[PDB]
Amino acid sequence: NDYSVTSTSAGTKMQMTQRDIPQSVTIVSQQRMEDQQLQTLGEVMENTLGISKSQADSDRALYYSRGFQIDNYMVDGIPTYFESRWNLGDALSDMALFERVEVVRGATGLMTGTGNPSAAINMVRKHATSREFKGDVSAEYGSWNKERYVADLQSPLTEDGKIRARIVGGYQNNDSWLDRYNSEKTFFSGIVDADLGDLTTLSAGYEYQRIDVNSPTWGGLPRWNTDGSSNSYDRARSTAPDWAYNDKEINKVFMTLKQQFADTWQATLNATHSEVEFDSKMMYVDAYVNKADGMLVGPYSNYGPGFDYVGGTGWNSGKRKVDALDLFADGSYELFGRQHNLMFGGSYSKQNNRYFSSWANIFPDEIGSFYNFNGNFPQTDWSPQSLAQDDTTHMKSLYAATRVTLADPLHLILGARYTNWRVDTLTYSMEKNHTTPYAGLVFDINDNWSTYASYTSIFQPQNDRDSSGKYLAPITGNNYELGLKSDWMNSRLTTTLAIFRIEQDNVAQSTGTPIPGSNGETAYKAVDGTVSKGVEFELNGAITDNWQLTFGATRYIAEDNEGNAVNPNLPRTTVKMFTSYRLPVMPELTVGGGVNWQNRVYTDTVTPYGTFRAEQGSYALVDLFTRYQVTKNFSLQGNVNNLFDKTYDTNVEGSIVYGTPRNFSITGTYQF
Ligand SMILES: CCCCCCCCO[C@@H]1O[C@H](CO)[C@@H](O)[C@H](O)[C@H]1O
Ligand SMILES: CCCCCCCCO[C@@H]1O[C@H](CO)[C@@H](O)[C@H](O)[C@H]1O
Ligand SMILES: CCCCCCCCO[C@@H]1O[C@H](CO)[C@@H](O)[C@H](O)[C@H]1O
Ligand SMILES: CCCCCCCCO[C@@H]1O[C@H](CO)[C@@H](O)[C@H](O)[C@H]1O
Ligand SMILES: CCCCCCCCO[C@@H]1O[C@H](CO)[C@@H](O)[C@H](O)[C@H]1O
The missing domain is CATH 2.170.130.10 (TonB-dependent receptor, plug domain)
Structure with missing residues (x-):
């Protein structure tokens, strides 16, 4: 709660x-x-x-x-x-x-x-976790024919309550604001929690999810006219044909073993085998519009006559397999007459992604005037799918970290993760070893306020070679941070203020000279990448016993080596808040809602006719909810999302994708 x-x-x-x-x-x-x-x-x-x-x-x-x-x-x-x-x-x-x-x-x-x-x-x-049969079931009805049914049930399976099980299952069917869109999803997770003897805990489970979407969109609506003027459409407008579909199926098995070896020391072994399979046939439109006739113009028609396509069709299928295990131990040790915490462990992961594709380009004659276009496009007589991609990534790590007690209110966290990383692709193989350091410092001023300072890193390997022919060193993302955190009511209310600087380093940059003794492979040089800097402030918790409020705000700047804004389509300033208020005089009633605010965003599109700049001014999105506890078991929740029915773009960096219009929802829940 x-x-x-x-x-x-x-x-x-x-x-x-x-x-x-x-x-x-x-x-x-x-x-x-x-x-x-x-x-x-x-x-x-x-x-x-x-x-x-x-x-x-x-x-x-x-x-x-x-x-x-x-x-x-x-x-x-x-x-x-x-x-x-x-x-x-x-x-x-x-x-x-x-x-x-x-x-x-x-x-x-x-x-x-x-x-x-x-x-x-x-x-x-x-x-x-409960030592009693517990659970809840719910039915929700909303806008665009949404129906959501959920059951969560748990209970011990033995008299001593040492063996326990929890089952979550649900189904959702809905349409959208988009013409012809339909989504159907089934979800189910089962887990068995058994306390084996003393100091040993074992968890084992299965997860299944299936989402089948009919007429899902691919790409967005044509934002630009040839003369530079922008376009606006009804939010119901879709380029998705009736034969378009995307279906995905997820199957996972996972186990967690925890062993208490000695006082203050515990060992954990987390393992998972995950699989996701998908099949889809979809169509996208990517073109400018000639205002007089409605005819579409390809964004690549400058390259020549075989490049003036205005969209595409695709039959794409695939499978991802993840076999991963994490093994770590956490405990205490005493150095210089004071207790310090030590964590050390290892990680193994094998991820394979295999894809099949069959696809075709769409030309202006095939689709006709966009003014008469509503997904009414003939399905491609698909040619046999071919192996488009087959990648295998092996990530192996050894990691250690200690929280040192310098003094009672002053702690220093020092860590490191060494990683052996490898990818095997149909066209190439790349192996990289990297050590990522962690250094942090936390000072407790008093019982409620703390300051911190930290250096944190991560590495990203890159498929780029230098003049010598060797693969370029991985990109390092370095984070420098200073901040202030507060804790109140035994962590019931917290606040955080962070000031960060990110330095992305060893980013590949083309030299404009090919690699000696290669077939035109371009030579790359490692240079300084994106620099990001900003401030974050969040208040999370209970103001009072019946008032829960989360309030956050951020402002940041992100620019590339050249000095140009990185991803200008994303808001630099945002304010996100949500609240819950239970009436002291009527504790059966809880009201609330929230506001998500973002400043202006943009994207420049360099075209043949000139530069076209996409614009999306400042906007807020307002959500409201109410919940009435009818009985100790039954409750009724009502939610309104995007209360002011704001029309806004979620794809400023490409073609027009509208955000969710105003939507309503009624939910009945039976708990026990
Ligand atoms: C959609 C789910 C509706 C659940 C309605 C549950 C009604 C519970 O009913 C109670 O069940 C107990 C045993 O479980 C019995 O011991 C009680 O006599 C009975 O009143
Ligand atoms: C052992 C602990 C060492 C922690 C080192 C963290 C150093 C913080 O680094 C500083 O962070 C600021 C952001 O607030 C930046 O403005 C500064 O440029 C940066 O040097
Ligand atoms: C007590 C203050 C400790 C550091 C926190 C403030 C860091 C704010 O960020 C600062 O912004 C300035 C420009 O606005 C830059 O000149 C500084 O390099 C940068 O650190
Ligand atoms: C001392 C605690 C923080 C003071 C309030 C936050 C003011 C931070 O200052 C801001 O920091 C950004 C990130 O460095 C800079 O880019 C901005 O120019 C600067 O206004
Ligand atoms: C798939 C739908 C599952 C419905 C499960 C209903 C479980 C009812 O469970 C019963 O509920 C009663 C209160 O209603 C309580 O008296 C009992 O503790 C509980 O056994």
Whole structure:
């Protein structure tokens, strides 16, 4: 029921309160997710301070933090990596399966081997913890024929309550503001928690998710006319044909073993085998519009006659396999007459991604005037799919970190992760070894206020070679941070103020000279990359016993080596707040809502006719909720999203993608 979650293992791999973490940490609680109906990982991230989204199409969105892209999401500290163009729906993961989401902003190289200096996102699974049959079931009806049904049930399976089990299952069907769009999803997670004898705990489970989308969009609506004037469409407008579909199926097995070897020492072994399979047939439009006739003009027609295509069709299928295990120990040691905490462990991960494609380009004659276009396009007589990609990544790490007690109110965190990383591709192989250091310092001024200072890093390997022919050294994302954290009411209310600087280094830059003794391979030089700098402030917790409020604000600057704004489509200033208020005179009633505000964003498009700049001015989005506790078991929740019905663009960096219009939702819940 509390917005503030007391402790976390996030950032350092050591169990502590947020105050003791010398990094910017945000934790999204179960209650916040229930109040605002954050049902997907994507919805959690877009309502999280310092995280922004870019929606390429109806089901594909990418998430950014501090000017950089998040390239992996994790489940119980196990990460799964992805490429921008191969979106396996990881942000569509159903939240009903997870207790909470831990967000760490900056360089998270101690938690994971590779990545960008953006953010680590960790989804924590629901566990069977009650010693009594407990659960809840719910039915939700909303706008665009949405129906959502969820059951969460748990119980011990033995008289002593040593063996316990929890099952979460659900189904959702809905349409959209988009013409012909339909999504159907099934989700299910099962877990068995058994306390083996004394000092041993074992967890084992299975996760299944399936999302089938009909008429999903690919790309956006033509933003530009040949004369430079911009275009506007009804938010219901879709380029998705009736034969278009995207279907994905997720199957995972996972086990966690915890052993208490001695007083103050515990060993943990987390393992997972994950698989996702997808099949899709879709069509996209990517062109300018000739205002007089409505005819489309290709953005690459300058290259010649075979390059004037205005869209495409594609039949894409594939499979991702993840076999990963994390083994670590945490305990105490005494040096210089004082107790200090020590964490050490290892990681192994094997990730394979195999894709099949069949595709064709679309020319202006094939589609006709865009003014009469509504997905009414003939399906391609698909040729046989061919192996488009087959990649295997082996990531192996050894990591150690100690929290040193310099004095009672002063702690120094010193860590390092060494990583052996390898990729095997159809065209090449690359192996890289890197040591990522962690240095932090936390000073407790008094019982409620603390200051911190930290140096954190992460590395990103790159498929670029120098004049010698050797692969270029990986990109390092270095985060320098100073801040102030407060804790009140035994961590029930917390505040954080962070000032950061990110230096992305060893970024490949073309020399404009080919590699001697190669077939035109371009030679690259390692140079300083993106520099990002900003401030974050968040207040999270209970103001009073019946008033829970989360309030955040950020402002940052991100620029490349040249000095140009990196991703100008993402807001530099944002304010995200959400609140819950239970009436002291009527405690059966809880009211609330929230406001997400962002400043102006833009994107320049260099075309043949000149430079066209996309604009999206300042806007807020308002959500409201109310919950009435009818009986000790039954409650009714009503939610309104985008109350002022703001028309806004979620894809300023490309073709027009509209954001969610005003939507309503009624939910009945039976708890016990
Ligand atoms: C959609 C789910 C509706 C659940 C309605 C549950 C009604 C519970 O009903 C109770 O169940 C108990 C045993 O479980 C019995 O011991 C009680 O006598 C009975 O009143
Ligand atoms: C052992 C602990 C060492 C921690 C080193 C952290 C140094 C902080 O680094 C500083 O952070 C500022 C951002 O607030 C930047 O403006 C400064 O340029 C940067 O030097
Ligand atoms: C007590 C203050 C300690 C450092 C926190 C303030 C850091 C704010 O950031 C500062 O912004 C300035 C320009 O606005 C730059 O000149 C500084 O390099 C940069 O550190
Ligand atoms: C001392 C505690 C912080 C004081 C309030 C925050 C003011 C931070 O100052 C801001 O920091 C940014 C990041 O370095 C700079 O880019 C901005 O120019 C500067 O205004
Ligand atoms: C798939 C739908 C599952 C419905 C499960 C209903 C479980 C009811 O469970 C019962 O609920 C009663 C209160 O309603 C309590 O008296 C009992 O503790 C509990 O056993």
